[PDB]
Structure formats: C-alpha cells, structure tokens
Design a binder for this molecule. Structure first.
Ligand SMILES: [Mg+2]
Ligand SMILES: [Mg+2]
Ligand SMILES: [Mg+2]
Ligand SMILES: [Mg+2]
Lengths: 169, 169, 169, 169
C-alpha cells in the first residue's frame, strides 16, 4: 500500500482508471473529427480547429486524472484506446450532434464516479471531480448545444460555410 | 448567540477549535525541525529551510481557521500548544518520515471534522474545508512522500547532502 | 477517388495509416512512462518530464502523418491504440532501454514505409519521410543511446537521482 | 562544356528547359485569370488577387529553374510562351477547377523530370526538385482542392461573393 494512501477506496481508484480511458477515448474521437474536416472533400478548417482543440483538452483531462491517481496513491492501469465509432462524421451539424452525446456520456461517467467517491465519504475526491470535471462538462454541453442550435439555424451550404468561419476566428 | 450565526452547529464550532490547536501543534513541530537542522552538528540548511517554510504555512492554516470561526459567529477558544514529540529528529529521511505521519494525522483530523459538518448539513463549512484544507493535505502528503522516496534513493552521506541542496535551491 | 490524388499508390496510403497507429502507440507508451515516474514510490520528476515531452512529440508525429494523408488525397483510417507493453517500467535505465527499442521499432517501420513509397516511385512521399521522420529517428536513437550510456555510468541510487536532475533542468 | 558541369546529363538539362516553359505557361494562365476577375462584369477582386499571387509565384518557379540550369552548367533555351487555353474563365469555381488541373499537369511534368534525373543518378537534381517543386505542388493541389470543395459548398451568387471576400482578406 502506498505511503500516501488515506481515505482512498479501491473502488474509487478503479473508477479513476475507468475515467482515464474514457477521457482518452474522447480525445481520439475528436482527433478523428479534426482530420475528417481536414479532408479535401470536406474542407471545413474551422470545424477541424474546434475538434483539434477539443481533442487536446480531452488529453489534458486524462493526464490530470493520471496525476490525481498518483497523488492519492492509487496506481494508473491503462487499457486499449478504442478507435472512434465512425471513420467519417458527415456535416458540421452531424459532428456537433455526436460531440454532444459524447460529452453527455463523459458527464454521466463522471457523475457515476462522483457517486462512488461520495459513497466512501471521499470528500476530497468529490471536490476534485466537482472542481475540475463536473463544471467543465456543464459548460461544454451548453456550448455544443448552442453550436447545434446555430447550425440548424444557418442550414446547409453557405450557412455551414459561415459557421465554419466563426469556429476558425 | 452571535448575530452572524446561521446553520452553525456547536459541534462544528468545537471541532474548528480542535483543528486550530492541531494546526498550531504542527507549526511548533516543524519549527523544532527547522532549528534542529540549523544545529552545527547537523548543518542541513535546505532541510532547515523546508521545515521553516512548513512551519509558517501551518501557522497560516491555524489563522485561517481562527478567521473562519469568527466569520460563522463561533468563538475561538485556544488551548496549550503541546511541545513537539522529540527534541532531535535524526536524519533528513527520519524527519520527512515524521512529517508524513504528522500530515496524515492532520488530514485524518480534517476528514473527521468534515464528517461532523456534513452530519449537520453545514454545506458551506464542508466547502471551506475541501477548498482550503483537504486539497492542500493531499498535495502535501504526495510531496513529502516523493521526498522520502528520493531520500531513500540517494542514501546517507553525500546523498543526504545533495538532497539538502535541492531543498535549499 | 480524391480530386487531389496523383502518383499515390494504395499501398503507400495504407502504410501511412499503419505508421499513424504506430506513432500513437509510442505516444501512449511514453505517457505511461511519464506517470509511472510520477508515482510517489518512484518520484523521478525529470524522467517523468522527459517521457511526457516524448509523448507529446509522438502525438505530433501522428498528426503530421494524418495531415499528410489528406494532402495526398488518402483517407485516414484509425485503429485501436494498444495499451503499453508494461504497467511499470523499472529504473530510469530500464525505461530508457525500452525507449531505445521502441524508437528503433518506429524507425524500422518508417524505413519499410519508405521502401514502399520508393517502390512506387513516390518521390514526394520519400522526401516527406526523409525530412520529417527519418532524420528525427536517427537523432532520437542517438540521444537515448547517450542517456543509456550515462545512466550505466552513474549507477543506481544517487547516480539515478543526479541524472534525473539533468533531465529536469 | 561548362567548367561547372558534373554528373549533369543532357536529358536532364533539356528537361529543365521544358519545365521552365511550363512554369511560364502557368504564370501566363494565372495572369489571364487575374485580369478576367478584374473585368467590370465579373468584379471578383479576391479571386483576382488569388490568381495574381499564383501568377507571381509561377514566375518565381520559372526563375529558380533558370538559376538552377546555370548552377549545373546547363544552358537556358527559352521557347514561346503559349497564350492561355481560354480568354474567359467562367465562375470562381470554374477557374479553381482549371487551376487544379493545371497544377496537376505541372506536377506530372515535375514527376517525369524527376524520373529523368533519377535515371541518370543525378542525386542533387532529384533533391532540388523534391525540395523546391514537388512539396509545393502537393500543398498547392490540396489548397486548390479545398477551395473547390468550399466553392461547391457555398454555391452561386452570394456564396461566390462571400468566398471572394475570404480570398481578398
Ligand atoms: Mg473530458
Ligand atoms: Mg495544516
Ligand atoms: Mg514518432
Ligand atoms: Mg510552378
């Protein structure tokens, strides 16, 4: 047992490892979207930039959990990063819709993880998740939802082009 | 009853006073370590600096709880500050090992205090402890644990000298 | 067929996708090493920094190939990122030794890929690999080899500590 | 024979002269497009700017080959610059489509020229073409392909106007 470990349940430790893989899964999916929008037959560089940035942030989310695992004296155990669900992601609206459901899946996983920590009276881990993950997901879900609504507003063709400009600017 | 007081249980108030004395106890122990390493027959000025800084921070932890007691309308009641457990603290590794167990004792006390506040639905006090005390203890326990591991790595003699340089720099 | 595509053989396109997954595999392995050295019972922050930086660079190598695939009109096809070969990586010397063999495996893969492009007279892809991948691997293999030799020179304990300082500085 | 000349085959020298005329042919065609889009009944100043810049760059490509011919001790032999294939170039999309096929024709010519140099083991000329011509063509073909895809996305009328703004900005 780690000389660090205190009030840290084995279930919370395993849930951290589960969340780490989920953050990496999201990172990989956003990276796929980024280079899908970089295809010559898609050519939406603002959408590409938005999902590239989303992918970098998910990588940061994963590493912060890796750091936290070690802080508490748990042990990082990594698993395969599953390839994304699709190879092509359709229109800008299609990809934002996928991104919304992905962010909500990550949020549900974090809420489940918070329930685990709370069930073991892990007050510090609960605050860590609230501060560094739960607030971010609410903001990210609202932001993408706004993108979806705007993308439906502007429609296909020129509208998608104009919104890509917004994401590039 | 204080014109301030609201949702503040007498047990939470008494637990704050208990934590105050514990923070002061840690302050005094680190101060002892600081001037132990300043002995001419010990002569480890980086270890001295590290524990001097640790002592100043524990004094700050105590005062912030004193401030918080008044914010909530509780009343600060001070007790004797017990002299440290030892007069001499051995090697740099020995003192870090003591520091780890002290920090874990402070952390257990804070976790107990958090359970008291939570049992009385004192949501604000719980957040105060999480934000200003529980995160710090996890970081401090990890930092000292890293020091212990490095101090075992470098060994006695020149190794202890070199790590003292690191702490001085 | 992509409106871009010219002098780009399907085998070269598939080899790019193979190299992409290999770069991501190396990225993941270095990330594992980074947080292994961040364990409280390992506590080698310079080694951690070196492999964190190595992981970021491998991620960049992957994305540049993703970009190149699209430039030529090929289509990025991603596969699972296999978890690293180990969960723990031993001493600093052990991890550098693993890193050397990983870099040589990546280099062999790139040399094979270069042979594929050259067999199809893909002069531009050959230059792209030479400029952005083959030179880097020779430099990276020499750098890690120097680390291994120095790590054997300094030995275990204090020596490993001192070399960690070098990597942190 | 030039006092410079070394490992420079007469076929490579003649191929350089062929490429020079082709670069000048592209320069002239882009210049035509530039002033077509400057017509009062076309009035697309961003498209005009894009093709003006393309024309200047093709002129630079030609001169660098002229310089290279002399460096190797070959002799520049110029031929008529054939007038462009059309006098009017249609919509912005039409002109980008022509530009794509022109760039691919230049790229095929360069690949053929590279095969000539490589067949005579002219390693330096091969590197010169790879470094200064083959990479540029891949980037230029991808860029124009992205323009075509975006121009189809935005459609005629206002869409063409908006993309002209992008090219002007
Ligand atoms: Mg995330
Ligand atoms: Mg304290
Ligand atoms: Mg690489
Ligand atoms: Mg040219």
């Amino acid at each position: 047992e780690s000389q660090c470990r205190q009030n840290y349940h084995q279930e919370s430790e395993a849930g951290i490892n589960r969340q780490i893989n989920m953050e990496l899964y999201a990172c990989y999916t956003y990276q796929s979207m980024a280079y899908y929008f970089d295809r010559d037959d898609v050519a939406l560089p603002g959408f590409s930039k938005f999902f590239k940035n989303s992918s970098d942030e998910e990588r940061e989310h994963a590493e912060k959990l890796m750091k936290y695992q070690n802080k508490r004296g748990g042990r990082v155990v990594l698993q395969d990063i599953k390839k994304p669900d699709r190879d092509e992601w359709g229109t800008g609206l299609d990809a934002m819709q996928v991104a919304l459901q992905l962010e909500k899946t990550v949020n549900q996983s974090l809420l489940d993880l918070h329930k685990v920590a709370d069930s073991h009276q892990d007050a510090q881990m609960c605050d860590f998740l609230e501060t560094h993950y739960l607030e971010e997901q609410v903001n990210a879900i609202k932001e993408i939802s706004d993108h979806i609504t705007q993308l439906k507003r502007v429609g296909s063709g020129l509208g998608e082009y104009e919104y890509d400009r917004r994401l590039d600017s």
